[PDB]
Amino acid sequence: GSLARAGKVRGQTPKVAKQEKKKKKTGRAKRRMQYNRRFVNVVPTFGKKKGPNANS
């Protein structure tokens, strides 16, 4: 078929610049944060388990 529409969508998406974020920790520090967030720091729940990236 016609090959003129190649790259149509990727060339239509409006450009958005990434924002500036503080650098993430690496190595042992990242694992310490994960351990403190998943097990050490827990709030009481009523059985409705939510995922880490739940929204609405």
Binding site: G47, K48, K49, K50, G51, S56
Partner: protein
């Protein structure tokens, strides 16, 4: 506020496109994992 009901979601979308998701949600409501 009570927003989402896993039981209703499964019972309605069990045969729809979003079945594999809602099932995965329902188990989280049941087994606590």
């Amino acid at each position: 506020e009570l927003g989402t009901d896993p039981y209703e979601d499964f019972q309605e979308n069990w045969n729809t496109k979003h079945s594999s998701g809602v099932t995965r949600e329902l188990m989280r409501e049941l087994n606590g994992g």
